Structures are given as C-alpha cells and as structure tokens.
Amino acid sequence: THRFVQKVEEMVQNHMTYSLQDVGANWQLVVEEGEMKVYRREVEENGIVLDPLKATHAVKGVTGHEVCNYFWNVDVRNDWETTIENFHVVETLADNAIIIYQTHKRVWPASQRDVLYLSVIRKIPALTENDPETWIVCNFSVDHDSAPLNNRCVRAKINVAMICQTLVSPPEGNQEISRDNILCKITYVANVNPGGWAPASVLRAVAKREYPKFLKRFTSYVQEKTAGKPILF
Ligand SMILES: CC(C)(C)c1cc(CCc2ccccn2)cc(-c2ccc(S(=O)(=O)CCO)cc2)c1
Numbered sequence: 001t002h003r004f005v006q007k008v009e010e011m012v013q014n015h016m017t018y019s020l021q022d023v024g025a026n027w028q029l030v031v032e033e034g035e036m037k038v039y040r041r042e043v044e045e046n047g048i049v050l051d052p053l054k055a056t057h058a059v060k061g062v063t064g065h066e067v068c069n070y071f072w073n074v075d076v077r078n079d080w081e082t083t084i085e086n087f088h089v090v091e092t093l094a095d096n097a098i099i100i101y102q103t104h105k106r107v108w109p110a111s112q113r114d115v116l117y118l119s120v121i122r123k124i125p126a127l128t129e130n131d132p133e134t135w136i137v138c139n140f141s142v143d144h145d146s147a148p149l150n151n152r153c154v155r156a157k158i159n160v161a162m163i164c165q166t167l168v169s170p171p172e173g174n175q176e177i178s179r180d181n182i183l184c185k186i187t188y189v190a191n192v193n194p195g196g197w198a199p200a201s202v203l204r205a206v207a208k209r210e211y212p213k214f215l216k217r218f219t220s221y222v223q224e225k226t227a228g229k230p231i232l233f
Contacts, residue, residue, distance in 0.1 A: 002093040004142065008120050011140050015161040016124055019054070019189045020134075027054065031212045038212050042204075045193075049203045053190045053211055059219045061179035062226050063233050064135040064164025065123070067186065070222045071162045072121040072137045074100070080221045083210070085112075090144055096121045100139075101148055104156075107206055110198035114153035118142045132165040154196040163187045166233070179231060188215060 023029075027039040035058040043050045059067070070076060074089060087102035097120040106112040117139045124134040141157040169181035190211070194203065 002097070004093060004097070004118055007142075008097060008118065008122075008138070011138050011159070012120070012122055012124070012136060012161075015136060015138060015163060015189065016134065019161055019163060020187055023054065030208055033212055033216070036212060036215055038208075038215070040207065044200065048194055048196070048198065049200045050191065050193055051204065051207065053192075053207060055186075055188045055211060055215055057186045057188070057215055057219060059184045059186060059223065061182060062184045062219075062222045063182060063231060064133075064166040064184050064186075065232050066226050067164050067184055067219070067222050068121050068135040068137045068162060069232070070225065071218070072096075072119060074098070076225075080218050082214075082217070088148070090116065090146055093118070099142060099144055103150065103153055107198070107202065110194065110202070111154045111196065112152050113156040113194065114148070114150050115156050115158055116141060116144055116147055117158055132167070135164045135166075137162045154194070156195045157193040159189075159191045161187075161189050163189070177231065179227070182231065186215075186219070 023039055027041060029037060029039050031038040036055065038053070038055045041052045043052060074087070077087065083104050085103040085105055087100055089098050090101050091099040093099065097118060099116070099118050101114065101116050103112060103114045119137065119139045121135070121137045124136060126133050139158060139160040141159070163186065165185045167183045167185065168177050171177055
C-alpha cells in the first residue's frame with residue numbers, strides 16, 4: 001500500500017466511466033488519419049486554454065498490455081518521447097506506480113513548463129464476462145515535498161490516460177495467436193492545464209499538429225519493438 005492508493009483508484013475509475021464513452025457534436029473531430037481520430041473541446045478557464053483532447057486509434061499486431069508497458073516504462077521514455085527536456089523519478093510508490101518530475105521543450109512565446117505527476121499502470125478486469133479487459137496508464141498531477149525548484153518553468157497540471165482494449169482471433173485448438181490477428185483499440189485522453197498565461201491560438205495549433213504526430217510515432221514504435229517477439233497479452 002501507499003498513500004495514493006485511493007486517489008489512483010478514483011482517477012482510474014473516472015477514466016473507465018467517462019473517458020471510454022463513444023464521442024457520438026460536443027466533441028469536435030479535428031484531425032483524422034486512417035483509424036486515428038483526434039477530437040477536442042475548446043475550453044478556457046480564467047483566461048487560459050484547457051481544451052480536453054480525446055483520440056481513438058486501432059493498432060494492428062500489438063496488445064494493450066504491450067502499449068501500456070511501453071507508455072509507462074521510464075526506461076524507454078527517451079526512445080519515443082520528443083517533448084521532454086529532462087525527467088527525474090521523484091518517488092517509487094509500487095511496482096506499478098511512480099511520481100515523475102519533467103521539464104518540457106518551450107512552446108514559444110510562452111514560458112517553459114514543468115510537471116509533477118503520478119504515473120500508474122493497471123489492468124482493469126472485464127466489467128462482465130462479455131466485455132474486454134482493459135489496460136490503462138494514467139498520468140495525473142500531484143503535489144510533492146521534494147518538488148524541484150526551477151525558476152525558468154511555470155508548473156502545468158495534467159491528467160492523461162492511455163486506455164487499451166485488445167481484440168483477438170480465438171486460438172484454433174493447440175495453436176498460438178499470431179500478431180496478424182490481434183488489434184489494440186486505444187482511447188487516449190489528455191487534459192493539460194498550462195498553469196499560467198499562454199496564447200490560445202498557439203496552444204491550439206501545437207495540439208492539432210503534435211498530438212497526431214505523437215500517437216503515430218508512439219504506436220509505430222510499439223509495433224516496431226514488438227515485431228518478431230512473443231506476444232505479451
Ligand atoms: C500544447 C499542449 C498540447 C497543451 C502541450 C504542451 C506541452 C509542453 C508544456 C506546456 C504545456 C502548456 C503550455 C505550454 N507548454 C506538453 C503537453 C503534454 C504533456 C504530457 C503528455 S503524455 O501523453 O503524458 C506524453 C505525450 O507525449 C502529453 C502532452 C501538451
């Protein structure tokens with residue numbers, strides 16, 4: 001156990017309840033690239049862009065467990081992440097939960113941002129014998145007494161989740177499932193609070209360009225790293 005067990009439960013359950021809904025007009029579809037659909041709502045609070053982002057995608061030949069492991073595992077973070085300048089693991093809470101501090105590349109003309117968040121990976125059992133199991137990574141801001149002092153940075157706050165359900169062809173008697181017959185259905189949600197002044201059109205343009213690039217690059221990277229390796233369901 002650790003002091004955030006209840007908090008992690010609430011944040012994960014909130015995603016399972018609300019984030020997995022189909023978007024079916026309050027979500028604007030902003031970018032479509034094949035099976036990748038990126039939606040957003042335009043929201044500003046006390047002057048600053050909060051725009052909730054939600055994306056679906058469908059990735060052949062990887063499992064949700066694999067996607068979530070690659071997304072969570074700090075040891076491969078630098079192989080796919082292109083927005084971070086530095087990260088530091090502040091605290092380990094469990095084999096599946098850590099607290100990370102990171103600084104991002106500056107988005108001109110706004111100040112550089114930093115972020116301090118708990119990152120957790122969980123498997124959520126099928127709601128009924130008829131539903132898929134879900135693997136989820138949730139990255140959500142927390143406070144911490146060993147927060148770094150970084151005067152060049154404004155502190156952003158995030159609530160992100162990478163949510164995956166995996167569909168397979170069943171095994172034909174004594175024969176494994178091939179990666180050809182697996183499909184990972186992703187819902188990715190990102191609620192980022194810049195934590196201070198930033199110009200709305202720039203944030204919007206950057207989100208619209210960079211989220212699709214991120215999803216494409218990260219999902220390709222998982223396919224590339226898992227090709228020809230045993231499936232980890
Ligand atoms: C422009 C905007 C899209 C809002 C934005 C700006 C910045 C840079 C820091 C920042 C935030 C706000 C304003 C200025 N700079 C970071 C993020 C962000 C952070 C973390 C995650 S994650 O999925 O946990 C890793 C994804 O690669 C995703 C996106 C988004």
